[PDB]
Amino acid sequence: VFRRFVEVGRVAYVSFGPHAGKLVAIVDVIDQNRALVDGPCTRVRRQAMPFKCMQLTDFILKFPHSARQKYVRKAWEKADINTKWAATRWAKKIEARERKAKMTDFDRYKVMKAKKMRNRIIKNEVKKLQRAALLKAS
């Protein structure tokens, strides 16, 4: 089975390379493994980009297969992609690895000082919900 399709008018997410972590669309399919790619709002110039550096989401937006740069900006800020991308459960765990890499050593000390009391409470509840299922059983 398949669900996510390459189709004229789909928004992909560039994984690596020079343009790290930007949503961008697909205008055209040149060949088996090459295309014509543009995103005007996330600070990208209209260029040619392969398929091995993009992983793709379930957003489409309707425009012609060689449309110039305006009709994309109309369909883009019409559907408001730059909020629904940031409202997904997929680009919140990106800034989570950014907050994790940008952690000051004091802000690591306040996690060692927050887990250590935090999980001696869960363990003191599981100890009572094993034998809250054992008083009934015995």
């Binding site: 765990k93 950014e98 994790k100 996690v111 927050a114 935090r118 409470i121 599981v126 919900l129």
Partner: protein, 199 residues
């Protein structure tokens, strides 16, 4: 401080290309279940590739001849001994760090085993090609112990289904006390989200 490895789905040259470097760099490696390894190419070509090695015995006293081991362990140890300088005291003091087992012994079943992704058949082979197992190969070439290994690799799968059930049974209790409590750990999470741990 001691590595472990599985043997299903890994290739033979790609695994021994990682392991003959990681041994020489001071790291004890144990590779278990070396009958689920599979070899590239079809079956009958790797069998004639091996029986043309079994025909090569030293002519005047074959007891001095090439010791043809038949187990899939002492084959994987053979094809590591080739990737090592086994005449010098930095080869003979490295092969006593490696330890190879057929099947899986009880000292290494209640431990989490690591899996190399760079040597897997589904990654490093096109999916329209042919592969060949090693166990059915050794049985075809003189290994007498599949009728024991198959049932000792049956009694532990039955023991680990049970251990996965009681792992789920403690996890649900953990997510229900984590549903009851969070009135009083409401403040020990607004300090974790702003440091990126529960997204």
């Amino acid at each position: 401080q001691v590595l472990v490895l599985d043997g299903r789905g890994h290739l033979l040259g790609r695994l021994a290309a990682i392991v003959a470097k990681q041994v020489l760099l001071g790291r004890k490696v144990v590779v278990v279940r070396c009958e689920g390894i599979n070899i590239s190419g079809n079956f009958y070509r790797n069998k004639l590739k091996y029986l043309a090695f079994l025909r090569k015995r030293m002519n005047t006293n074959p007891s001095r001849g090439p010791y043809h081991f038949r187990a899939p362990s002492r084959i994987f140890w053979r094809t590591v001994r080739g990737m090592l300088p086994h005449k010098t005291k930095r080869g003979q003091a490295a092969l006593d760090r490696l330890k190879v087992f057929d099947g899986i012994p009880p000292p290494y079943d209640k431990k989490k085993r690591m899996v190399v992704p760079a040597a897997l058949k589904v990654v490093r082979l096109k999916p329209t090609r042919k592969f060949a197992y090693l166990g059915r190969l050794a049985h075809e070439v003189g290994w007498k112990y599949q009728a024991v290994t198959a049932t000792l690799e049956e009694k532990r799968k039955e023991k680990a289904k049970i251990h996965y059930r009681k792992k789920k049974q403690l996890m649900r209790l953990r997510k229900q006390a984590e549903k009851n409590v969070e009135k009083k750990i409401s403040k020990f999470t607004d300090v974790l989200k702003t440091h990126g741990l529960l997204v």
